[PDB]
Design a protein around this ligand. Structure first.
Ligand SMILES: Nc1ncnc2c1ncn2[C@@H]1O[C@H](COP(=O)(O)OP(=O)(O)O)[C@@H](O)[C@H]1O
Ligand SMILES: Nc1ncnc2c1ncn2[C@@H]1O[C@H](COP(=O)(O)OP(=O)(O)O)[C@@H](O)[C@H]1O
Ligand SMILES: Nc1ncnc2c1ncn2[C@@H]1O[C@H](COP(=O)(O)OP(=O)(O)O)[C@@H](O)[C@H]1O
Ligand SMILES: Nc1ncnc2c1ncn2[C@@H]1O[C@H](COP(=O)(O)OP(=O)(O)O)[C@@H](O)[C@H]1O
Lengths: 77, 77, 438, 441, 437, 459
């Protein structure tokens, strides 16, 4: 299921939903840097830091099925 | 409704009608706070409470950022 | 205006010389207890108090908590008053000697005066001046006005989605901003945009008002321990990361006293010591009368009005000692004990009249005697709980005032505890298929 | 579909008159109990008044004498307006939180706030959508819609075209563009474009075009309790807690501030307070630590009226060791006001069995009904009300239409009433584990 | 100003002679308890010496005799140098940490580590940030007296960038570590902006020399070192309380390094005083740990109080003297107290009078002495405030016989409350039944 | 920075300061008045046999009980064993009231204390290049790759320690260290050998004044070698291996950077992990790298363990890798704490008691208390006359042993306050009334404390 949301019919409720339930600072901190940011950090004249210094997503501990639930038949069977 | 979720039902949204939430935010998070660097710098010289802060590898700004973010943003730091 | 069990209590009803007068301000009789509670109210207002204990004796049915609400409305809205029962001290997240200190820190009050300068109005331009400072013109329906912003409040405007002509609400002092909506002059720019189109405010742009407002020290303790509300976004998980009550150590309170005394010495805030009303103190066990005997000896502790109705009972948590009031005599010598005597039959009728003219239920004098008969012969809490159903049996049968017949019907529709015990024992004789299961 | 016949699916209200409060003996399901239903009528008419505190009415009586029946009658005779909350008194002993606070939330769940504010919505079939994404983007576009009466063209903002490709509005959908927010709830599909839908099921519902104007204002009425607002103002995004129970010890200053803002909402005329009903089923399962809190939560202005039901006679109080009537302490029995019920006369038993038979739609011969009344005289209502459902099925075994004596006498033969079960335990002692011994033949 | 007149406010130290240990009677608040105060003086003189580790001193006696008074006198007559810890016994029974660890932390708080050092800090108000985009830069800082221009190379320009320092801030640099700590803005730039932000707090300008060096004497406890080394950003745990069962290997490493610091002359160990108030609330599961924690070298001189006679021990079911197990009473030393003569009661009420600035006529003082002899100290001391307040209601300066008799008439002593309970038994909820008239 | 104080480096007197060992012969026969003890012959001989059992590595799960009344010397024998074994063999002195936790089951803290009691000694090597960087000079390759710019075949680093400097040729794939760690001229680094990726420690102290304000840590030059080929002995307890395998210390993600950021919780450890760690430690012993060293788990006050703990102790002692369990019980016929049914000897269940080598402990003679008084007095430094010794021995025989060892500190304080240097009879006769024992306290408590009244105790 998706998480329960609030049906409140103002614009502020939609803005607060898209700033809490999505909250792009944590998404940027979790997945990593934009390739434009990689280019401007790797063609510059001086070394500069990145706010996600590497991709902070943890490595999944199951190789064939990571972070989803969507499986498929197995050529084995 | 748009009264509770947006206007003045939330005790944190400092809209009109929720006249407390500006004052309470400022005078609990920045004036009367024991982690602001002004209220640390006066208590660092002996038996007092932030005696130890000189010896842990921090600074005043390290402690002040560490005492207002989440567990998330502190982990990104 | 809805009736509670203590709606008719307005104040203690004293003289100018501190002498109680009968049938005053809602009370009927009960002279010495109201005189003693008046002395208690004067002690709280005198500000020479760093922990005093007041116990209220007397059985159930007498007016113990009516005295406490009389004190709470005698102090006013200014001085804080925290009523907690004994059973609220038990938790599953903190120890029960820490919820006591949380109630003591909810008792003390800290009053701060502010002059909030609010800014309603439509944004006219968003002009970054330096290359930093960004001017904003706030157009009202009375006139626009320029405004120079700090480079940190602009990063709070910019997090909100304010673009061209959104009406906003800037706090000047606390720096708090809210986007109210899009102004109706730019309403039909497109035709199915999705905003909240609100009109331009037809007042000032710079409204200056002052607000007196209170803060309890427990709120200071919580706001200095853990980040609260504003930037605490990881709490939406819930399991381990929720704002669980944590063991606030003595070092944190010992520093918050330093900071609050600093802001009192600057003349910013004012200090007001409060009242902690712990009701039904027999539910407090001996692992808390040990801690109260220490925590009342601080130079910061508020006054504690304890209430207890029991006789010589067993102190909870230590089954091998009996004591008066359920209070250990280690602690009972601290307390100022006030008696609360029962009610004479000529002092119940006035309670019936006052409780009747509180609910609006008017009734003849031949029924006041019957309600007083049930008040003498059964109980006081029961006779006062027949004035409201009998009025329901009054306006249904084509009447306005309550006669003897409606109360004679309500005494059969609404049995008390005593006659129900008699039916439970005598009528419910055999324990079988159609009997009660003891 | 989720209306399976329960043990109280025949009660359609309290059944009493609302003009002279007379308990007419057979109406809306509740049949036979007169004095208790009149007292419950008086309590019900002082609930809807609102000008009384949280008081306490104790429905005491023997087992299977219609106590949950009267409570469910009061629940059905209020509608979805005044908040009725059931509370079996073992939901309190939790581990996510304490016990007194779990009781406080159940008090706060029954004080509604009812506020009424308007929205602007749009009905109508979409005639066509054109979106100027040409590399371009969601910049401009035209939306042509119609009702049976109206027809219109609108131009769209960027944050509306991003909601139109979000819901994928086709040419023929029946949508509801809430104008103040921008959400799109497709009410269905129009019938007249049934050819134009290929990626649908073979069985798919189709509506008609909406009738009336295309731009109208709705006066929706919401009603949320104080516990709702308490759980909302407790975390960052904390309303999920009241759908997952993960709320903890809510600090009391939040409840105090919300008790202040509700009064400030009432005095400004923006709101209205509706006191509800809290039904504490089986109140004898509380220890004295609960009663020492219910004695003071029934004191404030914001307290719902408590209705509660007790079976036990002179029994012990949990937590302590001393006995008391109804399993309740005497300082709490001073607060409550007691309604006593009575066992049922046999003709009332017969017509209650008649109502339970007509509820499940089972045909009965009058001889079988006489036998069933004779059984219910000696084994209670619950046994006979289960023998009805058993006897219908036993008649359906041998392909019969009406049940008879030859099926009630089989249901009485296979399924023992509890009196004969107690006799079976008393006459089979040595093999049933009493406390110590097991004997094997 | 968060300091109101409590019960323990007139006791400004122990009040004995420091030369020959002679407890003169009326000195520093305490009155006439000469043998117990002499024994507490001997205890205090073997505390300040600090050589003899891990004794245990029980203070028995009746209630309302002065067992916490002598403890607060010993707390006041040490100063801020030697630590002290007021822990009532019901604080130990927690739901986040067990009894053993929450009583180990009571021992770990009462031993200080003292270390003296030189703080090379630099206050200053920023005037002009000058960055040379060529890496180098120049910072201009001023005080109320001086103004200087210091060079900067590569990376603290980036620290300024991450801190967003504007012209007008009050920065502070710890040059032994090198990290910018922005203290806020100055009052000279409050006229500049109009709508301030949230984070900005205004301060005065720094005064004096920029380079401030000062010898400061830090004193931490071992509990501070234990909690800081618990987890990563664990320093805020000792303010919050969000710590639990700390492992024994961390405490072992910390005790080894404190011994190593004492060897290398960096640190000085200052043993202190643990005060376990009302020790009879501890169960046997706690005395079995106290009997071992008084054996190590790092154990404070424990002072404990008690009230009870031959009572049961909590957790078990056998009576014992003072509520303590006898294998623990073979280990402690006991200082008995005694009740008070009326000659001491009169001047104790006089000291409680002059503490609360309440004037008393001598007849009222004699009447209050008789009331204190017939009811106790805690009731007699609670009648000074009430008689003063009743005198304030009828507008009289000096309290009299009438006000003290009024206060005795209104409020009941605990001697008459028992007769009030036993006089009316049918209405108070005894154990079973109430009449309700 | 930190100012060093030139004071006296003394130590503090505990209750077991004077104990310095068992004091045996070369044949095991005890000798009275040696190394702190006075008398107690058979118990010291049996503890010497226990010490020999521990150092002989034949103990693999034994158990030793110390009976005897309170104040007779069980903990004294325990500290004597711990000081006799030394420091390089572990010793974990838990109590009975320390297994009760609120995060784990109480049959788990026992197993973690077993793992604290076992040590593992590992001997390895350490090969590092060390010191401050002077040059980072590349070298162009002989055959550059076509299509690229620079082609560098060997990167040169000049490392300067505090004793001698050295030029170093390296494989060019050190560059990914140097760019990621920002290593410049004047930064001490260490280069390992198994991988070869340098990690900067800090800016050196010689370059602490080229700038003025731009400061970080200014670590000194490594005052040692430039090419360490140094061997290391390393002692790790198996508790540390259990913790580091169960809860990993340093990770690179969000949730392990919340795990070390939130509080560390004791968690119960599954038995497959312990079985695997035992199976691999017993393999590295057979390779001849690591030495197993068993220690002592002195569970003091063994009558506080309830009956649910001895059941787990039977399993844990039957394990092939287990230390010795020196219990300490001072009760006679006692009710076991868990099952309130059986009155057993010592608080120990009769099933568990058969495993235990029961060592007795006898009361002290009335002419040995004065020798203990003399040793304790010359331990603290408090000197006193012989009549004072006889009076303290009189109080020791007639009242208690622990009470005559506590009339030495207030007597010394009153002595050096009165104006003397040694303790006489008058100072002890004055200090005997400022510090009452338990006996006269109970006499005052019963006689004067008649009943609960006004001036009375609270029974
Ligand atoms: N002097 C009084 N005047 C009017 N009503 C009173 C008075 N004393 C008591 N009451 C009534 O007593 C009831 C409260 O009893 P309460 O004090 O709560 O008993 P308890 O404190 O034992 O629970 C209230 O309904 C109030 O109307
Ligand atoms: N007046 C009534 N009208 C119709 N059904 C009734 C009436 N009274 C009781 N019943 C039936 O009897 C059964 C027992 O009632 P209930 O209140 O559940 O017993 P209890 O009070 O023991 O819970 C219910 O299933 C209900 O259907
Ligand atoms: N010798 C004394 N001189 C002056 N005041 C004293 C003296 N002894 C006790 N007091 C006062 O008597 C009160 C009771 O002493 P305390 O130690 O609290 O009794 P308890 O030991 O029963 O707790 C204290 O508030 C203290 O101020
Ligand atoms: N043989 C001995 N020689 C010297 N001192 C002893 C001896 N036996 C016991 N002691 C002393 O007796 C004191 C109490 O003995 P203790 O170890 O507490 O007994 P237990 O082991 O029963 O707890 C200790 O301080 C110790 O110094």
């Amino acid at each position: 299921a998706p998480p329960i949301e609030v049906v409140c019919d103002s614009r502020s409720a939609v803005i607060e939903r898209e700033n809490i339930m999505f909250h792009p600072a944590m998404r940027k901190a979790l997945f990593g840097p934009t390739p434009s940011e990689i280019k401007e950090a790797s063609f510059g004249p001086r070394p500069v830091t990145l706010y996600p210094p590497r991709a902070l997503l943890p490595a999944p501990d199951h190789d064939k099925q990571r972070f989803t639930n969507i499986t498929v038949p197995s050529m084995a069977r | 409704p748009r009264l509770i979720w947006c206007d003045g039902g939330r005790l944190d949204k400092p809209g009109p009608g929720n006249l407390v939430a500006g004052f309470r935010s400022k005078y609990l998070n920045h004036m009367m706070n024991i982690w602001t660097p002004e209220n640390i710098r006066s208590s660092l010289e002996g038996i007092e409470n932030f005696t130890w802060l000189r010896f842990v590898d921090t600074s005043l700004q390290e402690a002040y950022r560490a005492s207002h973010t989440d567990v998330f943003a502190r982990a990104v730091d | 205006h809805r009736t509670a069990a203590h709606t008719h209590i307005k104040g203690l009803g004293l003289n100018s010389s501190g002498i109680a007068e009968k049938q005053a301000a809602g009370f009927v009789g009960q002279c010495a207890a109201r005189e003693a509670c008046g002395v208690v109210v004067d002690l709280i207002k005198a500000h020479k108090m760093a922990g005093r204990g007041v116990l209220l004796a007397g059985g159930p049915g007498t007016g113990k908590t009516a005295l406490a609400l009389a004190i709470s409305q005698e102090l006013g809205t200014k001085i804080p008053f925290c009523p907690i029962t004994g059973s609220e001290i038990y938790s599953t997240e903190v120890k029960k000697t820490e919820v006591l200190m949380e109630n003591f820190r909810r008792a003390i009050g800290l009053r701060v005066r502010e002059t909030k300068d609010v800014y309603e109005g439509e944004v006219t331009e968003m002009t970054p001046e330096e290359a930093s400072t960004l001017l904003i013109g706030l157009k009202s329906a009375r006139g626009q006005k320029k405004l120079r912003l700090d480079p940190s409040i602009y990063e709070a405007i910019q997090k909100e989605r304010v673009q061209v002509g959104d009406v906003i609400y800037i706090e000047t002092n606390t720096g708090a901003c809210k986007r109210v909506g899009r102004s109706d002059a730019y309403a039909t720019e497109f035709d199915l945009e999705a905003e909240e189109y609100v009109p331009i405010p037809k007042g000032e742009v710079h409204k200056k008002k002052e607000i007196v407002q209170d803060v309890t020290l427990h709120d200071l303790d919580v706001a200095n321990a853990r980040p609260q509300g504003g930037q605490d976004i990881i709490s939406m998980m819930g399991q381990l990361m929720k704002p669980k009550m944590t063991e606030i150590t003595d070092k944190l309170r010992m520093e918050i006293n330093k900071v609050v005394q600093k802001y009192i010495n600057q003349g910013v805030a004012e200090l007001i010591p409060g009242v902690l009303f712990i009701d039904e103190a027999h539910m407090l066990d001996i692992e808390c009368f040990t801690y109260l005997n220490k925590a009342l000896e601080s130079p910061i502790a508020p006054i504690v009005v304890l209430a207890s109705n029991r006789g010589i009972a067993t102190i909870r948590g230590a089954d091998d000692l009996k004591a008066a009031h359920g209070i250990p005599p280690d602690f009972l010598q601290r307390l100022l004990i006030i008696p609360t005597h029962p009610y004479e039959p000529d002092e119940i009728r006035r309670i019936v009249r006052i409780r009747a003219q509180t609910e609006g239920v008017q009734l003849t004098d031949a029924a006041v005697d019957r309600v007083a008969e049930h008040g003498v012969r059964i109980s006081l809490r029961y006779c006062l709980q027949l004035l409201a159903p009998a009025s329901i049996l009054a306006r249904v049968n084509g009447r306005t005032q309550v006669d003897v017949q409606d109360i004679a019907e309500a005494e059969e529709l609404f049995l008390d505890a005593r006659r129900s015990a008699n039916i439970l024992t005598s009528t419910g004789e055999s324990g079988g298929l159609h009997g009660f299961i003891s | 579909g989720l209306n399976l016949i329960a043990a109280h699916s025949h009660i359609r209200g309290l059944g009493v008159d609302a003009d002279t409060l007379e308990p007419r003996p057979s109406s809306q399901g509740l049949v036979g109990q007169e004095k208790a239903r009149k007292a419950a009528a008086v309590v019900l008419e002082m609930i809807k008044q609102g000008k009384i505190a949280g008081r306490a009415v104790l429905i005491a009586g023997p087992p299977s004498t219609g106590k949950t029946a009267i409570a469910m009658g009061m629940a059905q005779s209020l509608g979805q307006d005044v908040p009725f909350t059931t509370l079996a008194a073992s939901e309190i002993f939790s581990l996510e939180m304490s016990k007194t606070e779990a009781l406080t939330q159940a008090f706060r769940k029954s004080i509604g706030v009812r506020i009424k504010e308007e929205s602007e919505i749009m009905e109508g079939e979409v005639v066509e959508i054109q979106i100027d994404r040409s590399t371009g983007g969601a910049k401009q576009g035209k939306l042509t819609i119609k009702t049976t009466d109206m027809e219109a063209i609108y131009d769209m903002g960027s944050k509306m075209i991003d909601a139109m490709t979000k819901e994928r509005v086709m040419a023929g959908d029946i949508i509801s563009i809430d104008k103040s927010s921008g959400k799109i709830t497709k009410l269905g599909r129009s019938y007249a474009r049934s050819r134009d839908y290929d990626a649908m099921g073979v069985d798919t519902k189709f509506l008609q075009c909406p009738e009336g104007e295309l731009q109208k204002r709705k006066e929706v009425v919401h009603t949320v309790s104080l516990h709702e607002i308490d759980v909302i103002n407790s975390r960052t995004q904390g309303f999920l807690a009241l759908f997952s129970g993960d709320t903890g010890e809510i600090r009391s200053e939040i409840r105090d501030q919300i008790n202040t803002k509700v009064a400030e909402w009432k005095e400004e005329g923006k709101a209205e307070i509706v006191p509800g009903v809290l039904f504490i089923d089986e109140v004898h399962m509380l220890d004295i630590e609960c009663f020492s809190y219910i004695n003071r939560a029934l004191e404030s202005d914001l307290a719902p009226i408590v209705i509660m039901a007790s079976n036990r006679g002179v029994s012990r109080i949990r937590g302590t060791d001393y006995k008391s009537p109804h399993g309740l302490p005497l300082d709490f029995l001073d607060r409550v006001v007691i309604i006593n019920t009575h066992p049922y006369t046999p003709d009332e038993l017969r017509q209650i069995l008649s109502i339970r038979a007509q509820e499940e739609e089972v045909d009965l011969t009058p001889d079988a009904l006489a036998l069933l009344t004779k059984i219910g005289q000696e084994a209670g209502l619950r046994y006979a009300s289960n023998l009805i459902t058993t006897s219908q099925l036993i008649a359906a075994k041998r392909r019969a239409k009406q049940v008879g004596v030859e099926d009630v006498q089989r249901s009485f033969k296979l399924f023992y009433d509890p009196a004969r079960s107690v006799r079976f335990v008393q006459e089979s002692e040595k093999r049933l584990i009493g406390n110590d011994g097991v004997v094997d033949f």
